[PDB]
Amino acid sequence: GPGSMSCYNEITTLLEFDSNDINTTQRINMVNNVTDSSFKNEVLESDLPVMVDFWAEWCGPCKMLIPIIDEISKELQDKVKVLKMNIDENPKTPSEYGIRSIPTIMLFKNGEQKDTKIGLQQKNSLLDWINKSI
Secondary structure, X not given: OOOOOOOOOOOOOOOOOOOOOOOOOOOOOOOOEOOHHHHHHHHOOOOOOEXXXXXXXXXXXXXXXXXXXXXHHHHHOOOOEEEEEEOOOOOOHHHHOOOOOOOOEEEEEOOEEEEEXXXXXXXXXXXXXXXXXO
């Protein structure tokens, strides 16, 4: 029958952006995400209590807790350091600390674990809880 012939074509692929990476000793004294190395390095070196929220965008109510933490972080900044850890960025994290579920709130103090709480918590709940643990 008819020779089913089809020669495939190709187009040159180009790059968008360049490569760049920098790092300096700046204080992590602000609500942000930390990476696994920096997590231990900074958190386990913080004498003052640190609240770490292990999160992911596939939760749902993240959109709420971001403003909640946005406001509360500055309230706690003096006493308790609000820090975030995405389970996408640090896949070893939820295995190490047995994070089955999200948000999720985990309390540290001098790098030592105080208490843990899973689920969505509001401003008053967060404050109330961490003040019980510290």
